[PDB]
Ligand binder design. Structure first.
Ligand SMILES: Cn1nc(C(F)(F)F)c(-c2ccc(F)cc2)c1NC(=O)Nc1ccc(F)cc1
Ligand SMILES: [Cl-]
Ligand SMILES: [Mg+2]
Length: 440
């Protein structure tokens, strides 16, 4: 029977995140046991657990908004056959609002999409932004990922939408923006197509006002790209099944019982407090092997117990995000573990938010744009918002370079627009600031 002292190089991540991002990413998602390639792939329990966590959150919150889950099995190329059925369900204002959500399966295999119909515009638009903030919370509170809320340009919004609001994320390592979630105000467009009308409170016939919104497992990919490091997966505590791994350290059989017993004590303390954890008591693997093994898998906290800790009635607690270590007295393990899990999430989010902030360069002229893109940034630019310019900006940025930059979103949070500020592209008067970047 073989003892494994050293976790071999090949079993760890062999590509650095900064030097080979694409290979780094595929190594992390497979070697961390998130997915298994069969170009389709399987969501193993560690991946599905993340989805199930954000699913539970989102379900709870949309039910407070009276959204009802449902399942519509018929799709067309991808969109759900649905709106043509709405006239069968809506005749008067008493039938409104209609609020539906579906959890679907099908490069991303799972997603959520919601659809609503309202008696007026203001209700529909309120819901669009309520859902958009729920997506902010999905990303921030669970995935520790910062996003930017905004409105898509006319050229990039959904064709059937009056406007498309979006949550935008940014992958700093390769300078790529990514649409993180979307929430559309569809106006009366589909109501006119399918005669989705109702008798209002004044006995006047009206069209319904619709919304739709969705988010996919892309969210998990964004999270991994954000927090992952050269040791592998890094998980916000809220989406890791095990919060803590306990690793026994001993080399003499005379220490085995006391170390094992003490580790079980700590395991009991945590699990009794509803903090799930794993005690890795495998005899065939060294402590050092186990350190690497569980870092690769993204466990937020490691607790080490060796003979020194027995003698000091302590233990060593190591954080996955920054590898900082501290000695903790046994009776303090529960509280310090609770506080550390909170601090790990806060640190993950704040570090990511700083990187997002530093990824945005405010420009006023197109001459500043290429320098920005090559530093893997996106730009915030004053823009006339003329739809014709969108393809012109893309084509030119492609030329001066998949290389092109496109309008990402017009952020809800707008800096002041100086009185005479011109469009960075057309020279025409600028209207608002818009984010532009290379994208997925
Ligand atoms: C397969 N794949 N390949 C890529 C790419 F190669 F393009 F990066 C991406 C991708 C990820 C994030 C992005 F912002 C863009 C693309 C993805 N998707 C992905 O891994 N999803 C996923 C991850 C973990 C999980 F538990 C469930 C689902
Ligand atoms: Cl339809
Ligand atoms: Mg559907």
């Amino acid at each position: 029977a073989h003892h494994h002292h050293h976790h071999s190089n090949i079993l760890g991540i062999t590509s650095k995140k900064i030097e080979n991002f694409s290979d780094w990413y595929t190594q992390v998602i497979v070697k961390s046991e998130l997915i298994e390639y069969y170009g389709c792939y399987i969501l193993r329990p560690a991946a599905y657990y993340i989805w199930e966590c954000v699913q539970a959150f989102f379900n709870k919150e949309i039910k407070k908004l009276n959204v009802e889950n449902s399942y519509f099995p018929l799709f067309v190329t991808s969109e759900t056959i649905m709106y043509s059925v709405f006239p069968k369900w809506i005749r008067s204002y008493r039938d409104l609002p209609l609020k539906l959500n579906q959890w679907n399966t099908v490069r991303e295999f799972l997603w959520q999409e919601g659809h609503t119909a309202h008696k007026n515009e203001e209700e529909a638009v309120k819901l669009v932004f309520d859902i958009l903030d729920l997506y902010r919370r999905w990303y921030e509170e669970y995935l520790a990922v910062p996003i930017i809320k905004g409105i898509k340009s006319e050229g990039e919004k959904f064709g059937g939408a009056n406007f498309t609001s979006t949550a935008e994320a940014f992958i700093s390592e390769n300078g790529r923006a990514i649409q993180a979630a979307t929430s559309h105000y569809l106006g009366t467009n589909f109501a006119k197509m399918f005669k989705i009308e109702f008798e209002d409170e004044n006995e006047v016939k009206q069209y319904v006002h619709q919304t739709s919104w969705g988010c996919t497992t892309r969210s998990i990919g964004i999270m991994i790209m954000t927090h992952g490091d050269d040791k592998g997966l890094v998980l916000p505590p809220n989406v890791s099944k095990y919060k803590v791994v306990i690793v026994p350290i001993f080399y003499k059989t005379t220490d085995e019982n006391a170390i094992h017993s003490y580790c079980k004590d700590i395991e009991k303390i945590l699990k009794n407090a509803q903090i799930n954890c794993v005690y890795d008591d495998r005899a065939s693997y060294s402590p050092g092997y186990k350190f690497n093994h569980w870092e690769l898998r993204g466990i937020p906290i490691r607790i080490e117990v060796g003979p020194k800790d027995l003698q000091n009635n302590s233990c060593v607690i190591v954080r996955r995000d920054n590898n900082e270590k501290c000695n903790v007295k046994k009776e303090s393990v529960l509280l310090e573990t609770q506080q550390m899990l909170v601090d790990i999430h806060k640190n993950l989010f704040l570090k990511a938010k700083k990187k997002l902030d530093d990824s945005i360069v405010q420009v006023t002229s197109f001459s500043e744009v290429m320098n920005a893109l090559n530093k893997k940034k996106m730009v915030l630019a004053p823009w006339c918002e003329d739809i014709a310019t969108e393809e012109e900006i893309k084509k030119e940025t492609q030329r001066l370079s998949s290389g092109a930059m496109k309008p990402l979103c017009i952020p809800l949070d707008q800096p002041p627009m100086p009185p005479n500020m011109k469009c960075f592209w057309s020279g025409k008067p600028a209207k608002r600031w818009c984010l532009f970047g290379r994208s997925y």
